[PDB]
mmCIF file of C-alpha atoms in Angstrom:
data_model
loop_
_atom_site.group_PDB
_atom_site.id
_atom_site.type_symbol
_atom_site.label_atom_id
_atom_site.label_comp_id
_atom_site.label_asym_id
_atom_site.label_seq_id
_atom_site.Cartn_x
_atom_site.Cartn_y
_atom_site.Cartn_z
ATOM 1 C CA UNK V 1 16.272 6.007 7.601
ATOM 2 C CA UNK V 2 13.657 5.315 10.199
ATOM 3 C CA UNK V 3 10.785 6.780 9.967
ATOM 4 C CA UNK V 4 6.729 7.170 10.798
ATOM 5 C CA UNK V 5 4.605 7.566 7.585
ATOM 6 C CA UNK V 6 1.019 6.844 5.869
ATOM 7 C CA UNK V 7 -0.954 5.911 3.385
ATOM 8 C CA UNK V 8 -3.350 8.404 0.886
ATOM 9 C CA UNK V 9 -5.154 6.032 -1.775
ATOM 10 C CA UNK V 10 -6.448 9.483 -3.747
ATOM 11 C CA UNK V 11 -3.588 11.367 -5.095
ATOM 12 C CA UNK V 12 -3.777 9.724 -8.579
ATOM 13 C CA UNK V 13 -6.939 11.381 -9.528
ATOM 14 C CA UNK V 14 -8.042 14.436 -6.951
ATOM 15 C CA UNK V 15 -7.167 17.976 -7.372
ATOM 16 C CA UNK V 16 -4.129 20.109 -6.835
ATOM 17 C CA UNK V 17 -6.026 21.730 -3.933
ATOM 18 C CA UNK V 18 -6.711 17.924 -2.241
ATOM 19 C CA UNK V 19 -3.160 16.678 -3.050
ATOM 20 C CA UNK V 20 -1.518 19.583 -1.783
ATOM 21 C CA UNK V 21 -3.453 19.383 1.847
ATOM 22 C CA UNK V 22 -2.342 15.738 2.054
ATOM 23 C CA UNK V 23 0.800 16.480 1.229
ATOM 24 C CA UNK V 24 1.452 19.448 3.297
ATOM 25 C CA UNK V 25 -0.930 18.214 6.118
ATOM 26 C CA UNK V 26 2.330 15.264 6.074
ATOM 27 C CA UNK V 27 4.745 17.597 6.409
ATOM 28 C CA UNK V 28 3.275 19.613 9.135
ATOM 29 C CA UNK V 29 2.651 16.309 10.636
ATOM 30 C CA UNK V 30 6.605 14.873 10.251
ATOM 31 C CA UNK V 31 5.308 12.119 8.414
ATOM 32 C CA UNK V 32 7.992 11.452 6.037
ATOM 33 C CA UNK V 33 7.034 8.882 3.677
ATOM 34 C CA UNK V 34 3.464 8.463 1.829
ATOM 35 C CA UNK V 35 2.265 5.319 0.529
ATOM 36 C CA UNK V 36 -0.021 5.571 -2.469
ATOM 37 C CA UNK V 37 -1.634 3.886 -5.334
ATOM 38 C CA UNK V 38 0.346 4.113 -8.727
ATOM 39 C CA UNK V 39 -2.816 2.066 -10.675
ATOM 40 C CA UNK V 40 -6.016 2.824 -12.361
ATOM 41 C CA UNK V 41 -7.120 -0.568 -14.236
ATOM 42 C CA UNK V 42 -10.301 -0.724 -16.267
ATOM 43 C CA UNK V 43 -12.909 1.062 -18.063
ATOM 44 C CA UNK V 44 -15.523 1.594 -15.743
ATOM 45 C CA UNK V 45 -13.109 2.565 -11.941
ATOM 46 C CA UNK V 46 -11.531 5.082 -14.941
ATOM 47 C CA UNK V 47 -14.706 6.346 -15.997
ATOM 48 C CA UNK V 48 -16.158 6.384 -11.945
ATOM 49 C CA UNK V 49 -13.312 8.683 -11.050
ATOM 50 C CA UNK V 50 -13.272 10.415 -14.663
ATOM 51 C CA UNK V 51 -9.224 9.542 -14.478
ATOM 52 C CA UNK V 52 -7.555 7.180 -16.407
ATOM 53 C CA UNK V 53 -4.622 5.174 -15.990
ATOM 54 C CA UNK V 54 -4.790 1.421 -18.047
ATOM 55 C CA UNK V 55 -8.484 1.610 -18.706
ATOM 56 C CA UNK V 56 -7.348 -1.447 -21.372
ATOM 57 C CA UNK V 57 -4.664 -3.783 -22.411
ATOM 58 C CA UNK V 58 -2.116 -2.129 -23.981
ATOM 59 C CA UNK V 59 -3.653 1.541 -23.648
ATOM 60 C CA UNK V 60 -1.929 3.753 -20.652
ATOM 61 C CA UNK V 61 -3.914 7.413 -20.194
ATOM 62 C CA UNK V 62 -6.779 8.817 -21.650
ATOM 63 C CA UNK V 63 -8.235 6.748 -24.333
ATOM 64 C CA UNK V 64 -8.775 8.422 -27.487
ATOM 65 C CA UNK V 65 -12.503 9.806 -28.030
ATOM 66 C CA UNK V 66 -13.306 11.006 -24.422
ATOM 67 C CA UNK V 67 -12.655 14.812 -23.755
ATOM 68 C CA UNK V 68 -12.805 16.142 -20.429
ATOM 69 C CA UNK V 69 -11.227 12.927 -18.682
ATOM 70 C CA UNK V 70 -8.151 13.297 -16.627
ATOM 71 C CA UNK V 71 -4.992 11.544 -17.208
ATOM 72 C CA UNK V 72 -4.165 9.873 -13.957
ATOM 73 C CA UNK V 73 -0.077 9.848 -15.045
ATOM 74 C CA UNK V 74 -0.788 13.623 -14.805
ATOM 75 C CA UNK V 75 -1.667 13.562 -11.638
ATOM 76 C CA UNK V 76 0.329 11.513 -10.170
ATOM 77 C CA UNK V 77 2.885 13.676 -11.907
ATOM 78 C CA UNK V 78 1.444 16.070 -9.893
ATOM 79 C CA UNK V 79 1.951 14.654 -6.812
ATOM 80 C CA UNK V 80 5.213 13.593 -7.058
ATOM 81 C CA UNK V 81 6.752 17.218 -8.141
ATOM 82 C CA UNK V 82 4.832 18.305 -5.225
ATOM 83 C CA UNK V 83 5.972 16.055 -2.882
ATOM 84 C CA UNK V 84 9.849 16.281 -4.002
ATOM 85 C CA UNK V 85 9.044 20.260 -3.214
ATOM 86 C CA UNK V 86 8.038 19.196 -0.072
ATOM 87 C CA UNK V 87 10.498 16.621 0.889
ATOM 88 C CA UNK V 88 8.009 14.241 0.994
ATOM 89 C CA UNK V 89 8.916 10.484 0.190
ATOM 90 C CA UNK V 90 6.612 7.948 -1.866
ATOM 91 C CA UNK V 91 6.004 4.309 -2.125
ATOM 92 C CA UNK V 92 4.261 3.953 -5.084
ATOM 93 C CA UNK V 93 1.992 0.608 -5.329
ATOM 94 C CA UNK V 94 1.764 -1.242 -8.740
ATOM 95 C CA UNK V 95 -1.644 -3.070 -8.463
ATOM 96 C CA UNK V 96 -4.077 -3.796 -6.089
ATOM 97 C CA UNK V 97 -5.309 -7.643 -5.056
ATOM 98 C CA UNK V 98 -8.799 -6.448 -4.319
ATOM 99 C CA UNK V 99 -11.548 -5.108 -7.175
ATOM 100 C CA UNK V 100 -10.799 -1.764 -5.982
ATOM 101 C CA UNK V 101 -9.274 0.716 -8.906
ATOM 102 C CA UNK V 102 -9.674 -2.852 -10.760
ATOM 103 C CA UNK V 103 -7.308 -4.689 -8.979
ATOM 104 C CA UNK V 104 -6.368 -8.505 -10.295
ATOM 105 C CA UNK V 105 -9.901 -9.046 -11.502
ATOM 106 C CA UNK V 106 -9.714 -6.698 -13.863
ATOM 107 C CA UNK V 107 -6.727 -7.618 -15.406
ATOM 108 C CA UNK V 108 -8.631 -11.023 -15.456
ATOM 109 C CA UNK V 109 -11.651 -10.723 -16.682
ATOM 110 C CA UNK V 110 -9.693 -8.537 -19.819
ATOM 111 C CA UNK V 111 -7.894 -11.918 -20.678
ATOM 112 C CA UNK V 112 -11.705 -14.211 -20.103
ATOM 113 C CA UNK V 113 -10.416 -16.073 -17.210
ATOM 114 C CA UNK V 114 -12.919 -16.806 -14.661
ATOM 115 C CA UNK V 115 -10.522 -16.843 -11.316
ATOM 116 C CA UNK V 116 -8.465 -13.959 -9.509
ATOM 117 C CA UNK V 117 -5.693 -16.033 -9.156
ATOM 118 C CA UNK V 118 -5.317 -16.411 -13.264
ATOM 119 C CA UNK V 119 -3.269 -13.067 -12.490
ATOM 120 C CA UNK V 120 -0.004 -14.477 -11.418
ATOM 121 C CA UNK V 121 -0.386 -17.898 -13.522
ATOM 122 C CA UNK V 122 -1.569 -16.428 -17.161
ATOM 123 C CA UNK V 123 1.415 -15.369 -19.363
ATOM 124 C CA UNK V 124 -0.407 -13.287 -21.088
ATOM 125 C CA UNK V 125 -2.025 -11.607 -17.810
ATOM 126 C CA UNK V 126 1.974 -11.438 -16.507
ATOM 127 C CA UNK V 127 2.209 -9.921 -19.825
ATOM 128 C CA UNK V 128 -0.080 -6.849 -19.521
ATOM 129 C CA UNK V 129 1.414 -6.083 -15.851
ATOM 130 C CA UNK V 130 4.925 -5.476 -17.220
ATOM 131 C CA UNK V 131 3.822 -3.401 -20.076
ATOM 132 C CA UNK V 132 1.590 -1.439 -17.209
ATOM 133 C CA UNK V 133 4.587 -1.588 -14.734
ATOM 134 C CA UNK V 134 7.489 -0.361 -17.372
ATOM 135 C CA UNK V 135 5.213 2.437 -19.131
ATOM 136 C CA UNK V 136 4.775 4.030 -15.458
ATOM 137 C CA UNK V 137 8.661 3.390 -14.845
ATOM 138 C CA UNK V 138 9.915 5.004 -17.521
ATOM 139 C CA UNK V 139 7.399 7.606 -17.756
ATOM 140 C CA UNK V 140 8.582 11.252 -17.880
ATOM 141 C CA UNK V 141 6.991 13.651 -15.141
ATOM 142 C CA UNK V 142 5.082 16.598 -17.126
ATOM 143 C CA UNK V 143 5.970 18.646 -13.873
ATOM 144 C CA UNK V 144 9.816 17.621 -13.411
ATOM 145 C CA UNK V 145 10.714 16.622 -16.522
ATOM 146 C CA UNK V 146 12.268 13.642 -14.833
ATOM 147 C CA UNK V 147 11.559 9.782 -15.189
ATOM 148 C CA UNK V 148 10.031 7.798 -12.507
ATOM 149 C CA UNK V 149 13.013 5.756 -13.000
ATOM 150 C CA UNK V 150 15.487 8.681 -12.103
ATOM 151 C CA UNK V 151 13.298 10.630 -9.227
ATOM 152 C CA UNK V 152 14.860 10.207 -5.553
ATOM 153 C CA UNK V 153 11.452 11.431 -4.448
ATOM 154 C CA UNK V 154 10.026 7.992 -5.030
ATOM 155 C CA UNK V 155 11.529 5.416 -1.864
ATOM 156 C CA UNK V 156 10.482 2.277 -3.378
ATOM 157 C CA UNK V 157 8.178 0.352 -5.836
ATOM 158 C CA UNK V 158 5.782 -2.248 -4.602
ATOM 159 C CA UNK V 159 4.403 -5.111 -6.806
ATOM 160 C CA UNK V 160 1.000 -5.626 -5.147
ATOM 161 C CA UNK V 161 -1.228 -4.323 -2.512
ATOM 162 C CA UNK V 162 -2.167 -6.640 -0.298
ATOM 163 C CA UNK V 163 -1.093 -9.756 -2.698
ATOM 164 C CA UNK V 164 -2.784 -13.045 -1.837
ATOM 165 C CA UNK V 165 -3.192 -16.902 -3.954
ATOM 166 C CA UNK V 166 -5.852 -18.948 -1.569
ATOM 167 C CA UNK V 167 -5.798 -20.938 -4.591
ATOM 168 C CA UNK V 168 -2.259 -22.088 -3.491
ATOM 169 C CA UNK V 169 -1.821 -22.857 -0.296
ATOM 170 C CA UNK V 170 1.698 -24.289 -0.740
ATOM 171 C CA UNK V 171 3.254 -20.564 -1.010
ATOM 172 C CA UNK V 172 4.905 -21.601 -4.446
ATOM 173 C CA UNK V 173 2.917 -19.454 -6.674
ATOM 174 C CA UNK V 174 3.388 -16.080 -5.214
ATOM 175 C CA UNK V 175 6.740 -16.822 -4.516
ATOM 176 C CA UNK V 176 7.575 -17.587 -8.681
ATOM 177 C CA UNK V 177 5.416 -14.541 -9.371
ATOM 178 C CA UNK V 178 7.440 -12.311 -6.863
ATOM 179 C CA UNK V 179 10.504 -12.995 -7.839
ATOM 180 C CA UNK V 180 9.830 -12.768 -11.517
ATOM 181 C CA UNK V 181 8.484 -9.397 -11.086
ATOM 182 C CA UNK V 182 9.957 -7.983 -8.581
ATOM 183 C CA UNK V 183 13.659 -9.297 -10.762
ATOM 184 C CA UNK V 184 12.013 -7.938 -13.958
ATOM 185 C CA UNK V 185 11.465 -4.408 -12.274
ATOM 186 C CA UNK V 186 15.547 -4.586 -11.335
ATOM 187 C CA UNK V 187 15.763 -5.046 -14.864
ATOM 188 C CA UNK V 188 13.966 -1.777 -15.377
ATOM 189 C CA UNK V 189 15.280 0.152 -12.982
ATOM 190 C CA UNK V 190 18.449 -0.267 -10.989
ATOM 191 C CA UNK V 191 18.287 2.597 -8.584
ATOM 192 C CA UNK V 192 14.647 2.043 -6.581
ATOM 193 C CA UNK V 193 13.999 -0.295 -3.261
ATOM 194 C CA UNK V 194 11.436 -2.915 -4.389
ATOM 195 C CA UNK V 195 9.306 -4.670 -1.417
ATOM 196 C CA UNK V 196 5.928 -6.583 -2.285
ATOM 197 C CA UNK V 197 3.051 -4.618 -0.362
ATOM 198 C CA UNK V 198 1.799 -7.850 1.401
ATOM 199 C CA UNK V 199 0.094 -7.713 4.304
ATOM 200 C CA UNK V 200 2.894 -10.277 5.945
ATOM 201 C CA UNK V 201 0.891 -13.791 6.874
ATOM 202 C CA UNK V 202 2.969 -16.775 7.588
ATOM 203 C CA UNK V 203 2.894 -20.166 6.438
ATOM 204 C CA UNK V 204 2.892 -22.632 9.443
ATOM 205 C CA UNK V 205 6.512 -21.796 11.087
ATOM 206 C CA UNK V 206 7.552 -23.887 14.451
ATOM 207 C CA UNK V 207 7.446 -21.313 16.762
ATOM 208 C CA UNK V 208 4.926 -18.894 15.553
ATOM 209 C CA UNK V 209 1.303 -19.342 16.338
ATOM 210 C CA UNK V 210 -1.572 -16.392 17.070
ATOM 211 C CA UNK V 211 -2.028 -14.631 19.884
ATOM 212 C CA UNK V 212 -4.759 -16.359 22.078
ATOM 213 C CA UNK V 213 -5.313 -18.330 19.306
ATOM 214 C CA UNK V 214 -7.394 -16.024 17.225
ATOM 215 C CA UNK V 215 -6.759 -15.533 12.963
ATOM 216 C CA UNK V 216 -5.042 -18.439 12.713
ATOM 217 C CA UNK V 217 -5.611 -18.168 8.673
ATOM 218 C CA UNK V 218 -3.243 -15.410 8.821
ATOM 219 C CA UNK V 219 -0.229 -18.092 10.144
ATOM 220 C CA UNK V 220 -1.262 -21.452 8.634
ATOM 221 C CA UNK V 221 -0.306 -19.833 4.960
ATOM 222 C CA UNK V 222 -4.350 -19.859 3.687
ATOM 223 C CA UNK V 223 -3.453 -16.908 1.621
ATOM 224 C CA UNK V 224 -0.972 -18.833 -0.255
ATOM 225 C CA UNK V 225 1.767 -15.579 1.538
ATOM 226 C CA UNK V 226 5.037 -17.513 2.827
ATOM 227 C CA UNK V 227 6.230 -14.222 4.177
ATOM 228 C CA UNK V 228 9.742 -15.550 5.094
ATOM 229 C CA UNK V 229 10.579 -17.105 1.676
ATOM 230 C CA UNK V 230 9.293 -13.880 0.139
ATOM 231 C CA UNK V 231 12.145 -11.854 2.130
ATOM 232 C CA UNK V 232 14.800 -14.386 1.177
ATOM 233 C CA UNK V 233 14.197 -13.364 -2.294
ATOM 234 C CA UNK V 234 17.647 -11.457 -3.532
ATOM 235 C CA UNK V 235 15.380 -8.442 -5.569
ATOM 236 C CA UNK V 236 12.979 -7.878 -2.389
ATOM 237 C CA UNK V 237 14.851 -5.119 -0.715
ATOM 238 C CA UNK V 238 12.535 -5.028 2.649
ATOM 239 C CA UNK V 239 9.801 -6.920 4.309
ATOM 240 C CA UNK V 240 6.014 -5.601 4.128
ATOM 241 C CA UNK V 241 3.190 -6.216 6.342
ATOM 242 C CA UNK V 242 -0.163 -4.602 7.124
ATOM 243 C CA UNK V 243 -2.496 -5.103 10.724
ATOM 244 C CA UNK V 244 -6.239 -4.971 10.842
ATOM 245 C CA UNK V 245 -7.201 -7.094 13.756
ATOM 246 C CA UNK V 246 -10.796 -5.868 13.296
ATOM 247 C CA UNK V 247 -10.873 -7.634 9.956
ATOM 248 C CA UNK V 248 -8.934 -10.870 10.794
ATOM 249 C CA UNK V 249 -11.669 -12.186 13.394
ATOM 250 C CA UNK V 250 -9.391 -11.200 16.349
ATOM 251 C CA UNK V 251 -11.638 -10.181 19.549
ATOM 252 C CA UNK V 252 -11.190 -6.326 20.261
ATOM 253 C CA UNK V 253 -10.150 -7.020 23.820
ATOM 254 C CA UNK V 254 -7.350 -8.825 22.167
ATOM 255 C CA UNK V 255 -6.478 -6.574 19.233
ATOM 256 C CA UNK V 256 -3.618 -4.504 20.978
ATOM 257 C CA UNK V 257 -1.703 -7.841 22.049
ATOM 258 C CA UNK V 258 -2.305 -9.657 19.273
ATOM 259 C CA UNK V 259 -1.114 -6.727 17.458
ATOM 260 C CA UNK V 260 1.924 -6.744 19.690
ATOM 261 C CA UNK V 261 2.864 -10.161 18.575
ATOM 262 C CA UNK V 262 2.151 -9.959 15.164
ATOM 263 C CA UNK V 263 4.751 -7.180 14.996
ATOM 264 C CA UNK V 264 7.219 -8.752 16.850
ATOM 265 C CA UNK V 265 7.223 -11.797 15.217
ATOM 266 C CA UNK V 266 7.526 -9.830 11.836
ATOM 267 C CA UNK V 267 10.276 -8.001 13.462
ATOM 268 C CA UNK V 268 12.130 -11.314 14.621
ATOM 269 C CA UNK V 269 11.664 -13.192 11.239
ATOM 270 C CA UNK V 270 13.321 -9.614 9.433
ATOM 271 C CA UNK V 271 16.230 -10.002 11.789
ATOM 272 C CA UNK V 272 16.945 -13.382 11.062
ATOM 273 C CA UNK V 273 17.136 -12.961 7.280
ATOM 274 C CA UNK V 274 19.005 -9.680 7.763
ATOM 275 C CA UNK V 275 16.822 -7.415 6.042
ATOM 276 C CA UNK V 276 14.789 -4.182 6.798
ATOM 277 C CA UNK V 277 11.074 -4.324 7.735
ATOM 278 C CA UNK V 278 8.108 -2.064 7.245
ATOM 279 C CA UNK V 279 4.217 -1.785 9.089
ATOM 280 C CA UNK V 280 2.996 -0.002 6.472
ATOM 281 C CA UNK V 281 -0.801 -0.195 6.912
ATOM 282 C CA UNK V 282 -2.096 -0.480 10.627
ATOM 283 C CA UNK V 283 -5.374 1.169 11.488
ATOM 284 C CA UNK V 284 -8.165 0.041 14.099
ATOM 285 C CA UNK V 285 -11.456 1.251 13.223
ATOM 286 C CA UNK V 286 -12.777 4.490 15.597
ATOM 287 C CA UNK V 287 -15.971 2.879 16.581
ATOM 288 C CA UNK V 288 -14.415 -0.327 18.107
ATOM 289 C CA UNK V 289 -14.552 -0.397 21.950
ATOM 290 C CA UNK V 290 -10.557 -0.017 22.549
ATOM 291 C CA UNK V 291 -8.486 3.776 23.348
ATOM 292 C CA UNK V 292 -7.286 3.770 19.718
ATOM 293 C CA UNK V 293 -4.423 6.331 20.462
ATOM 294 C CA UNK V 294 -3.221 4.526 23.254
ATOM 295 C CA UNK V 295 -3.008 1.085 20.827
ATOM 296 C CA UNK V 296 -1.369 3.092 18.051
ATOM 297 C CA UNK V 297 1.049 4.358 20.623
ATOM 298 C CA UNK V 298 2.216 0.796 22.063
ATOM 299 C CA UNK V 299 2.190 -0.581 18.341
ATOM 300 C CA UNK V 300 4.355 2.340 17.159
ATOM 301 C CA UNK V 301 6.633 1.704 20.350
ATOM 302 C CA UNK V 302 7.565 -1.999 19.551
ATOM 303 C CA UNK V 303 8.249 -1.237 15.568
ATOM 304 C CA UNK V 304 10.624 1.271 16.780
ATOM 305 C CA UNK V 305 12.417 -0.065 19.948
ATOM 306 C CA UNK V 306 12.421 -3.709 18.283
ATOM 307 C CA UNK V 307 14.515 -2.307 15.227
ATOM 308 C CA UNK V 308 11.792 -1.749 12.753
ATOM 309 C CA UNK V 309 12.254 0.721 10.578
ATOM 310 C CA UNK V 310 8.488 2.025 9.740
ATOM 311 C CA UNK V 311 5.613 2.335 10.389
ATOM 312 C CA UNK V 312 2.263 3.736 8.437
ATOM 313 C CA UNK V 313 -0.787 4.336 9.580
ATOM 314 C CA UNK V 314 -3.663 3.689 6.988
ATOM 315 C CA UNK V 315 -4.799 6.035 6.180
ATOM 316 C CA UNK V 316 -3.835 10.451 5.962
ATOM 317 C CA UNK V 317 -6.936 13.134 4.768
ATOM 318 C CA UNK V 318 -7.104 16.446 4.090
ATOM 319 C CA UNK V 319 -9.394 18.742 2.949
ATOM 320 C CA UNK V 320 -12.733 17.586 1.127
ATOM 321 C CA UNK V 321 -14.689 18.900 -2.471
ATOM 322 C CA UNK V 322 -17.902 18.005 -3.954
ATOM 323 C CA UNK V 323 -19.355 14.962 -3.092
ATOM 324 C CA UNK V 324 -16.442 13.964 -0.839
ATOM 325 C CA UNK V 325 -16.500 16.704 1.726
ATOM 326 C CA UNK V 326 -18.140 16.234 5.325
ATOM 327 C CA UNK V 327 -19.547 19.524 7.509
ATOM 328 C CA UNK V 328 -16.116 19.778 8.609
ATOM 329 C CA UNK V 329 -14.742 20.776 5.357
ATOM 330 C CA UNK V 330 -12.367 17.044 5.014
ATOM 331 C CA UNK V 331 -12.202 14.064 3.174
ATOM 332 C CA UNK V 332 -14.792 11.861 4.309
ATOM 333 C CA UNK V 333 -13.833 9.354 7.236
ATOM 334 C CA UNK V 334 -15.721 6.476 4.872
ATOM 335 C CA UNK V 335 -13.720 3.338 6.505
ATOM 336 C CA UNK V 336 -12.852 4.628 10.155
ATOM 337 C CA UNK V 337 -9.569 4.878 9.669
ATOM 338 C CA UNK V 338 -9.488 8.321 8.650
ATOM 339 C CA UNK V 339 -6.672 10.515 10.491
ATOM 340 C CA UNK V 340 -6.726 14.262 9.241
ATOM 341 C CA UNK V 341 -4.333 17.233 10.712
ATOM 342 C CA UNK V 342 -6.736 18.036 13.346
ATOM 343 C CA UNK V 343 -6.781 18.381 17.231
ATOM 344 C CA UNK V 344 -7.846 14.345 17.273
ATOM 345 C CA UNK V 345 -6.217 12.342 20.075
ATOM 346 C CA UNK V 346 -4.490 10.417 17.127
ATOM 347 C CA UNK V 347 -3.414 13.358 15.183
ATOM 348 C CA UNK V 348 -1.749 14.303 18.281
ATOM 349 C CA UNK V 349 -0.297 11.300 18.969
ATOM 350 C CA UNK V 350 1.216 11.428 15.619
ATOM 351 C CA UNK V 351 2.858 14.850 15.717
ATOM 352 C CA UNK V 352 3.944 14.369 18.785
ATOM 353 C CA UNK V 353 5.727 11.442 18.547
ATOM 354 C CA UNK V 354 7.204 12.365 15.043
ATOM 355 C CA UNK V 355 9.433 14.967 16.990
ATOM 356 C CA UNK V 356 11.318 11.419 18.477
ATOM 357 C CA UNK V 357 12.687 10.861 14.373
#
């Protein structure tokens, strides 16, 4: 099961009308598989999107004593039934490292520590994630009647968008924290993939240095990520890793090669350890001075003839509402990574080269 797929941030708390355009916009697309966000942490990103997920500790949904809230179980309910309608496959991401949707801090500053890094060292902190982590597991969808636990539609569980510990450089935190979750969701649920939802970053391996010499944080393990003792972890299923050249300090003249290596390199280290790999964010931002499509097409190209098994784009729109629709009727492009279902050079690209799977 090869395939090409994205990422949609938004289908925990839009509208039917907004998840269904993602959704079928996918489909229409061939992108099989949709990455999303499965968390909502803390009073005040619940209240900004008037959805609530674990706007507390120990309190999952709408709190009591607000009325017209949404539940954000209900919509990801929502999403998933309609997804499973459309064949549609979903990694569904557990928390995010940054503030965004609450993220680690969050879950920090409920339990008065003072550091984001408290999250994978605090027992009580490790606590409160796999209360959040088995109430979303075993929930029952309103819409299918199934649990998460027991619904093919969902491809895999990931433990942490975009995990990082600069506060330990040595790798050993992250790698106790992933493998007690990740072994603790087994526990849970026997019959899902689980993969981390790092972005990949080494930790000083002979043999592996930067392309022209440029984000060399991202293989001297400053993140505290040893990506390769991550994937030799028995209850990681596949490797993650993400590619933003724009935002590691790489040159743009150099982001399609360094790119290139960072991909094969992942792909290499996968082999080795015999286990799948996935590029499941990659985006370059429209306004840099590079031919985006043609970049997109030669990183596509190495995932799949180097044995790769994915790879996402970040990120899929469809149609706006409100405050979030530009004079084009869509989502807002609000990053420059936006790709939406339209005559684009990279939305052709996409369904184009989707016909090869």
């Amino acid at each position: 099961f090869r395939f090409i797929g994205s990422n949609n941030y938004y289908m925990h708390y839009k509208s039917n009308r907004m998840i269904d355009s993602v959704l079928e916009s996918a489909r229409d697309m061939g992108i099989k598989v949709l990455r999303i966000w499965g968390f909502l942490d803390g009073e005040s990103y619940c209240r900004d999107k008037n959805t609530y997920m674990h706007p507390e500790p120990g309190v999952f949904g709408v709190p009591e004593g607000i009325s017209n809230a949404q539940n954000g179980f209900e919509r990801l309910d929502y999403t998933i039934a309609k997804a499973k309608e459309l064949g549609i496959k979903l990694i569904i991401v557990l928390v995010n490292n940054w503030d965004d949707f609450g993220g680690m801090n969050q879950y920090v500053r409920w339990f008065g520590g003072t550091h984001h890094d408290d999250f994978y060292r605090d027992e009580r902190i490790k606590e409160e994630y796999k209360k959040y982590v088995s109430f979303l597991i075993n929930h029952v969808n309103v819409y299918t009647g199934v649990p998460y636990r027991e619904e093919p539609t969902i491809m895999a569980w990931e433990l942490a968008n975009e995990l990082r510990c600069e506060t330990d450089k040595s790798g050993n935190t992250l790698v106790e924290w992933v493998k007690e979750m990740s072994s603790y969701i087994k526990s849970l649920d026997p019959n899902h993939l689980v993969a981390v939802g790092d972005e990949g970053f080494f930790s000083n391996y002979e043999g592996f240095k930067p392309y022209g010499g440029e984000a060399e944080w991202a293989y001297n393990g400053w993140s505290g990520v040893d990506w390769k003792k991550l994937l030799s972890i028995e209850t990681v299923d596949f490797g993650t890793f993400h590619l933003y050249p724009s935002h590691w300090g790489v040159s743009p003249e150099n982001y399609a090669q360094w790119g290139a290596k960072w991909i094969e390199d992942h792909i290499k280290i996968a082999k080795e350890i015999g286990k799948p790999v996935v590029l499941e964010e990659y985006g370059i931002p429209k306004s840099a001075p590079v031919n985006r499509t043609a970049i997109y097409r030669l990183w596509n190209d190495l995932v799949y003839d180097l044995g790769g098994d994915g790879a996402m784009f970040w990120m899929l729109a469809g149609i706006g509402e409100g405050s979030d629709r530009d004079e084009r009727g869509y989502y807002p492009d609000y990053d420059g990574f936006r790709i939406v279902n339209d005559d684009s050079p990279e939305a052709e690209l996409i369904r184009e080269y989707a016909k090869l799977f």
